Amino acid sequence: KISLDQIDLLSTKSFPPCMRQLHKALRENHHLRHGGRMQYGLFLKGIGLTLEQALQFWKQEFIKGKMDPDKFDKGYSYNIRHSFGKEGKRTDYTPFSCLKIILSNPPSQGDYHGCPFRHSDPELLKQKLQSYKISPGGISQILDLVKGTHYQVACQKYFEMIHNVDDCGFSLNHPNQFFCESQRILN
RNA sequence: GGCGGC
DNA sequence: GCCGCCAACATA
Numbered sequence: 001k002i003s004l005d006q007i008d009l010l011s012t013k014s015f016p017p018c019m020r021q022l023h024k025a026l027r028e029n030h031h032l033r034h035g036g037r038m039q040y041g042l043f044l045k046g047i048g049l050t051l052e053q054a055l056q057f058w059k060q061e062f063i064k065g066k067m068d069p070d071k072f073d074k075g076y077s078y079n080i081r082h083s084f085g086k087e088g089k090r091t092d093y094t095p096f097s098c099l100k101i102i103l104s105n106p107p108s109q110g111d112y113h114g115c116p117f118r119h120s121d122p123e124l125l126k127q128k129l130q131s132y133k134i135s136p137g138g139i140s141q142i143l144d145l146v147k148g149t150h151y152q153v154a155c156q157k158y159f160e161m162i163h164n165v166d167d168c169g170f171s172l173n174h175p176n177q178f179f180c181e182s183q184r185i186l187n
Numbered sequence: 188g189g190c191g192g193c
Numbered sequence: 194g195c196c197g198c199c200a201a202c203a204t205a
């Protein structure tokens with residue numbers, strides 16, 4: 001039901017901070033390192049894209065990287081299809097959970113994957129939070145949680161703020177959950 | 188990105 | 194250089 005020329009907006013309204021960053025990095029650089037391609041690609045599949053849309057979405061953005069639209073089909077296409085279970089063993093991989101994103105494959109320079117509340121240093125997180133136009137009160141309420149290592153809670157706090165609600169009404173532990181609960185309120 | 192094949 | 198096959202796992 002979801003369409004491609006609708007993602008840029010969705011990233012702002014319903015994507016949790018991690019996926020939002022990942023999308024922005026993708027649009028600005030026209031590319032993403034492995035870690036991000038994994039985290040974001042499966043998220044996109046979790047929200048609804050089909051294999052046709054995924055290949056389109058990724059190809060389109062990588063051509064802007066000015067690379068051979070063939071060098072794309074060469075490497076990148078097979079792996080996208082394998083994500084959707086259409087190659088090898090044929091496993092329709094479930095998208096990543098929070099605990100996994102937070103406790104594993106920590107990001108390095110050049111990477112945008114991971115959990116902002118956990119991998120972005122307090123000072124850079126605050127700037128992001130401010131860029132998302134989050135009230136200095138909640139931003140302060142989030143940083144606290146972060147300092148207490150309650151990353152998922154800090155994210156729920158971010159959810160409640162961009163949605164103008166008192167209680168998100170669910171315990172967060174998976175990015176696509178954050179998306180669904182958001183779409184519930186907006187759509 | 189890793190592992191694997193030439 | 195060319196190429197294949199992997200990982201995940203919430204979820205009302």
Ligand code: SF4
Nearest residue numbers: 016018098115152155
């Ligand atoms: S808490 Fe879970 S969802 Fe919110 S950002 Fe960290 S990872 Fe993405």
Ligand SMILES: [Mg+2]
Nearest residue numbers: 034075076188
């Ligand atoms: Mg590569």
